Amino acid sequence: AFNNFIPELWSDMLLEEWTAQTVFANLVNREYEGIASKGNVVHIAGVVAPTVKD
Amino acid sequence: AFNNFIPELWSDMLLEEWTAQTVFANLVNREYEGIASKGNVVHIAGVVAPTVKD
Numbered sequence: 001a002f003n004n005f006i007p008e009l010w011s012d013m014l015l016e017e018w019t020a021q022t023v024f025a026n027l028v029n030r031e032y033e034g035i036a037s038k039g040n041v042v043h044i045a046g047v048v049a050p051t052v053k054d
Numbered sequence: 055a056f057n058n059f060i061p062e063l064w065s066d067m068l069l070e071e072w073t074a075q076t077v078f079a080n081l082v083n084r085e086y087e088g089i090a091s092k093g094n095v096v097h098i099a100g101v102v103a104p105t106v107k108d
Contacts, residue, residue: 007093011086015100 032042086096 008095008097009086009089009093010097011089011099015098017101017103 032044036042086098090096
């Protein structure tokens with residue numbers, strides 16, 4: 001038969017990866033991004049409540 | 055009795071076969087019929103993603 005004159009076709013589009021939808025960066029707290037515009041650490045501190053005495 | 059003079063009759067119309075409804079040729083992707091008017095292969099390529107580095 002025709003061993004040389006029958007072509008093969010290439011699709012001009014690549015298939016994209018199917019990738020998981022990213023969600024977590026919108027669910028967690030972002031407030032420290034203003035202060036963290038500089039430096040490589042943020043120190044976050046919390047109260048220790050005074051003890052109720054009898 | 056009339057053993058020889060009473061007809062038997064043939065209906066002039068064939069019964070059509072009862073056949074399953076075809077569905078799958080409408081449900082799948084058809085886009086490659088545009089390029090596949092020639093040849094015996096379509097090559098379909100896909101991305102391999104760049105790797106994140108530390």
